[PDB]
Amino acid sequence: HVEGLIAIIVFYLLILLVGIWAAWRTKNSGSAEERSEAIIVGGRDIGLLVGGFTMTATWVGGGYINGTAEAVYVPGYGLAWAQAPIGYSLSLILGGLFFAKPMRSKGYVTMLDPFQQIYGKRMGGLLFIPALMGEMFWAAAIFSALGATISVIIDVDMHISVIISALIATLYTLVGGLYSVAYTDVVQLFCIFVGLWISVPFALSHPAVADIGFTAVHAKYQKPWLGTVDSSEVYSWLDSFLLLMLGGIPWQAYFQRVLSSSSATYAQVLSFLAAFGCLVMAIPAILIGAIGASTDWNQTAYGLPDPKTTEEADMILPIVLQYLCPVYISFFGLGAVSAAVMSSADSSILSASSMFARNIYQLSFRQNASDKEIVWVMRITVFVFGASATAMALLTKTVYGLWYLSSDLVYIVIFPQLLCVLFVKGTNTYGAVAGYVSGLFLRITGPFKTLAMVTSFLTNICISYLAKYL
């Protein structure tokens, strides 16, 4: 109620102030005669602390902490079917092991730079379409989820909340660039960590909560929360896991921090330190889900209808932090959830705008452009993309339907091409078109998600080698 609103106002004011202050601090830190790169790659000196904070904050936002508890709470699901915490960590480990050093060693600026140099500028432009939709729909889904969460916590209609959040996210982003985004994520990580880890001890001691050890393997009010994977569901489980594991890498939000580190060796340690952070920040969510599963919602104020019978199972974590915690701590908990839902919007906006500013506007349409023109183009693009994302979140009712399609398209199309450029020699632009056509055809017409990725990958190689033989 009042405590939640007081937390939100303070948190957003602090974030705005830090974002503005970072721009003043770091306006002069860059190549003095190349201002276009200073707002994209950041001057190529970010250490272990700031890098480790921002890389962790990128991957631990969105629906992570609010859908990790829901999977544990809902009967028929459990720890077996909560695959985000393990998918993200394995994706980060694989990235740091195999992809991070080669990309940073060659000193690229954007993810599309490898493609345009070998395949061609036209093919680099064609691969811009799948990425831009993903970056512009992840932000829309995040904005919708934030509105839902805030309308549950307090009563302010979705429009004002989403508009006020999006304006603040865009304002410091266009003013600062990468440095504001990186310096504003330390506050978010500290808020989330402190709130969740101070809330969890108080919830566990409520008289209504039972023993989470006994509930895990024995049924008291509902089915055990460890879960079970049936013999029929093995392949669906593997496909769902592989989507997150092998589809989180080919994103520019990830490659904007791999390419902005001091050296190749410091671009691996950040991934290895973010893999640990993803696991560290997921334990309180699992614990809150287990609490919610073990609780008896008849002595608390929520009333006899259980949250999953009233059809509020997406908001189990706010309900626990509100009803099973004292107000002093509920303040910190609600601030933490509000910080958690908002984490990965600015990174997506900056990632979407940087590629259009560099690869599309500069390198293809207008090569002969000064740095001032490109700076203004980047700022205008940031504003337009933020406005478009907010409008899509508020008006259209098909945000998730398009997010699901774009997520599949990225994993089926972009990932096979990245492997081919980085690790396979002899590839041509005659096989890139074949892969791009074959993946799209199978996705649109008709586990078939992973089989399309292998068909897209294996059609890239055979045609490219065949074209050499003609």
Ligand SMILES: *[C@@H]1O[C@H](CO)[C@@H](O[C@@H]2O[C@H](CO)[C@@H](O[C@@H]3O[C@H](CO)[C@@H](O)[C@H](O)[C@@H]3O)[C@H](O)[C@H]2NC(C)=O)[C@H](O)[C@H]1NC(C)=O
């Ligand atoms: C949920 O909480 C309620 C309290 O809000 C409790 O319900 C208890 O259930 C007992 C049944 O063992 C009931 O007691 C009976 O009440 C009738 C009148 O309706 C009376 O004629 C009987 O002699 C007997 O006392 C009553 O509904 C209620 N009892 C008390 C003392 O509150 C209980 O804690 C929980 N119930 C469930 C179904 O989860």
Ligand SMILES: COc1ccc(C(=O)NCc2cc(C(C)C)no2)cc1OC1CCN(C)CC1
């Ligand atoms: C194929 O790539 C992904 C597939 C699924 C997810 C995922 O988060 N799913 C659960 C979910 C939904 C929601 C709502 C907001 C809609 N919040 O969480 C994320 C994926 O890539 C991200 C990986 C981290 N970073 C690079 C951004 C992209």
Ligand code: NA
């Ligand atoms: Na961020």
